[PDB]
């Protein structure tokens, strides 16, 4: 039953992916409704195909990971309403590549890429919320950063499942949560008036973008 409350609150996810798609559709963004489209039926295969393999984890994984690509489609949604393409790309593309670690890691059978993928997933989607309100607050800076920060996140999932490799998307989410807490430091930096702190805040934050990038393209 344990796996069954798992494939319930799978269903849950996809009635919320579904009722996107809806919402998706009424604000007229078929690309959008097509990503919550694939989305959705990516839900209901991986459900099947994990409950017919036995595989909780895998269930708990796949559905944390599509709640978070539905999260990261409501802001899509938001970012479009904003005037955003490139966050209503980035987000896209960061959906699609959950879409198929989702996918792949199924029909590998390996429930811990789907995890580390939602996790830096779940990250980057915290990132893209503080790019918004970054692009509200007049922070060009802030905005960038977190755009970079989200692109190293996305490559690093679509690079770590085209590799197979679940090892390095944990690496580099926990890279990108320091990312976030650093961003966080920046926005204390920010607050407090000190232009040389946040200058060093964005700095470090580049540095782990950079570094993240780099080690993340040799492997």
Do not use: C, H, M, T
Not at 9 to 17: G, I, L, N, T, Y
Not at 26 to 37: V, Y
Not at 59 to 66: D, G, Q, S, T, Y
């Amino acid at each position: 039953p344990e796996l069954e409350e798992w494939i319930r609150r799978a269903k849950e996810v996809a009635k919320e992916v579904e009722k996107v798609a809806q919402r998706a559709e009424e604000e007229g963004n078929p690309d959008l409704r097509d990503s919550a489209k694939e989305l959705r039926r990516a839900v209901e295969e991986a459900i099947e195909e994990a409950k017919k393999q036995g595989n909780p984890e895998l269930v708990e994984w796949v559905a944390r990971a599509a709640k978070v690509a539905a999260e990261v489609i409501k802001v899509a949604i938001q970012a479009e309403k904003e005037g955003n393409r490139d966050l209503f790309r980035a987000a896209l593309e960061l959906v699609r590549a959950v879409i198929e670690a989702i996918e792949e890691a199924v029909k590998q059978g390996n429930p811990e890429l789907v995890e580390w993928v939602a996790r830096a997933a779940k990250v980057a989607a915290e990132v893209i919320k503080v790019a918004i309100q970054a692009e509200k607050e007049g922070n060009r800076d802030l905005f960038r950063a977190a755009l970079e920060l989200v692109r190293a996140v996305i490559e690093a999932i679509e690079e770590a499942v085209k590799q197979g490799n679940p090892e390095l998307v944990e690496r580099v989410a926990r890279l990108a949560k320091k990312a976030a807490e650093l961003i966080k430091r920046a926005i204390r930096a920010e607050k407090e008036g000190n232009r040389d702190e946040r200058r060093e805040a964005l700095e470090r934050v580049r540095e782990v973008i950079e570094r993240i990038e780099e080690l993340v393209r040799q492997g």
